[PDB]
């Protein structure tokens, strides 16, 4: 399979209540491995995964500084967008960054990216050629012009082509036993009453990794994606995920609906109908 390093960084002003909240979370494949939070007691990059303890003192101080630097940068960023959008100093605003790179199993760059948004909406994002920028609106068009002038894009391609892929590689190895594992899902179905002589069949899938999975309800050779109802796959609080999908069938004929679970740890999909 392919893998990826993923940063989720947030800045958010709180006028009247001091400097902004700046946080940074880092993910190698659905596995949280790093965190920074300017609201901590002693704000410092901290491990979120045993395999990141391995890293020595130097790493943690470098990340913690370039983090503190980014924090400062978004303080500036936040005032700047105030002017751009002609917004008044008195409100609370958010900047968001998604940054990282995915690679293939040969370990080569597959794709890189860095995306910014302000107050929820897209602002500006590096295109896939790792050269151009796509601006969301004319405000983020100024930022664009700034960054073409400052060779920020070719500077980012050095980080993406280089730093990012080479540490993803690092991480995948440091933590091969964790990141490269495969927990198969265990599944069941629950039954629930409903007015009008109808019945709800929920198919649960639990304790699995990676997060990617598919559940379908079938009936005599055709899926019912439309008359289904699922929940986004979710973290279960221990580095595993779970998902459930339900379907409304008529009482007496629930025996004929079957559930299907597709996943990396499932050589063959799972098929289950009900526990009368």
């Amino acid at each position: 399979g392919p893998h990826s390093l993923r940063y989720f960084v947030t800045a958010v002003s709180r006028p009247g209540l001091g400097e902004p909240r700046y946080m940074e979370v880092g993910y190698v494949d659905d596995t949280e491995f790093v965190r920074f939070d300017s609201d901590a007691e002693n704000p410092r990059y901290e491990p979120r995964a045993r395999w990141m303890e391995q890293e020595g003192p130097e790493y943690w101080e470098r990340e913690t500084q370039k983090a503190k630097g980014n924090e400062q940068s978004f303080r500036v960023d936040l005032r700047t967008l105030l002017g751009y959008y002609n917004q008044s100093k008195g409100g609370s605003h958010t900047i968001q960054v998604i940054s990282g790179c995915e690679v293939g199993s040969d370990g080569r760059l597959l794709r890189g990216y860095q995306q910014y948004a302000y107050d929820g909406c897209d602002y500006i994002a590096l295109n896939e050629d790792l050269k151009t920028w796509t601006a969301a609106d004319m405000a983020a068009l100024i930022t664009k012009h700034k960054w073409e002038q400052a060779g920020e894009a070719e500077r980012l391609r050095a980080y993406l082509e280089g730093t990012c892929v080479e540490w993803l590689r690092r991480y995948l190895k440091n933590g091969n036993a964790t990141l490269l594992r495969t927990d198969s899902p265990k599944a069941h179905v629950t039954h629930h009453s409903r007015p009008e002589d109808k019945v709800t069949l929920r198919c649960w899938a639990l304790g699995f990794y990676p997060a990617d999975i598919t559940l379908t309800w079938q009936l005599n050779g055709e899926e019912l994606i439309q008359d289904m109802e699922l929940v986004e796959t979710r973290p279960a609080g221990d580095g595993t995920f779970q998902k459930w999908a339900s379907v409304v069938v008529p009482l007496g004929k629930e025996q004929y609906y079957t559930c299907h679970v597709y996943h990396q740890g499932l050589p063959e999909p799972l098929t289950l109908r009900w526990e009368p």
Partner: peptide, 9 residues
């Protein structure tokens, strides 16, 4: 060397 040195807008 892990996370990015973020630019100002």
């Amino acid at each position: 060397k892990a996370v990015y040195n973020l630019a100002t807008m």
